[PDB]
Amino acid sequence: MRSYRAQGPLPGFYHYYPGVPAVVGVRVEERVNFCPAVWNTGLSADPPLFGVSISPKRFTHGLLLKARRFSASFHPFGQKDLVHWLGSHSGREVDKGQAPHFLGHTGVPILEGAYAAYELELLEVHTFGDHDLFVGRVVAVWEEEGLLDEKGRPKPGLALLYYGKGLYGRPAEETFAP
């Protein structure tokens, strides 16, 4: 097993991929923006907290600080092209608010087509190196009935997986219960 000591950023920082990308939706007055974030993770069950790590270079970063509210939606593999487009263009140069969406109970924009989504209230923001972790509290939950099993898990094969550098995939249908 090859090894090397870190000497700065890694040549490729993708050893822990693939991951489901969370589409972050944010609205400031009339302006709506969306941006996928593969650096996301649950942070607490009670209370339910979910975090997304966003670079200060993204237009979304400033919008999140202004709105203090956002959505995190999870999309089927069938929307790979839309998700990639949203992650390859900036709100500084194109109105991504034209992507089909609706407003949640708290007013956050949710990209249409998701099998599930969270409406979040921003609790804290922490800087870790070149990205800021936005920690949100889940205040509302959206689910496309029939796409999640009895336990709330997205059915096998439906989720969009990101491998980094524009490469996507999906889970196999087969599962295992050790």
How far is the C-alpha of 171 from the C-alpha of 162, rounded, in Å? 11
Instruction: From 25-33, 56-64, 90-98, 154-162, give the range in contact with a second copy by CB under 8 A.
Output: 154-162
**Cβ atoms within 10 Å of 35's Cβ, excluding its own:** 26
Burial class (CB in 10 A: 0-12, 13-18, 19+), 133: middle
Among 30, 93, 100, 151, binds a second copy (CB under 8 A): 151
Among 34, 70, 74, 134, binds a second copy (CB under 8 A): 74
- Dihedral of alpha carbons 72, 98, 132, 159, sign: positive
Min dist. Cβ of residue 122 to a second copy (A): 13
Site membership for a second copy, residue 72 (CB under 8 A): yes
DSSP 141: E
Site membership for a second copy, residue 116 (CB under 8 A): yes
Min dist. Cβ of residue 145 to ligand FMN (A): 26
* Rg of the chain on CA atoms, in Å: 16
Site membership for a second copy, residue 81 (CB under 8 A): yes
DSSP 79: G
142 binds, among a second copy, ligand FMN, none (CB under 5 to 8 A by kind): a second copy
Instruction: Write out the residues near ligand FMN by the rule CB under 6 A.
Output: 21, 33, 35-39, 53-55, 58-60, 83-84, 87-92, 131, 162
Site membership for a second copy, residue 90 (CB under 8 A): no
Backbone dihedral angles phi then psi of residue 173, each to the nearest 5 degrees: -75, -30
How far is the C-alpha of 3 from the C-alpha of 5, rounded, in Å? 7
Site membership for a second copy, residue 84 (CB under 8 A): yes
Site membership for a second copy, residue 85 (CB under 8 A): yes
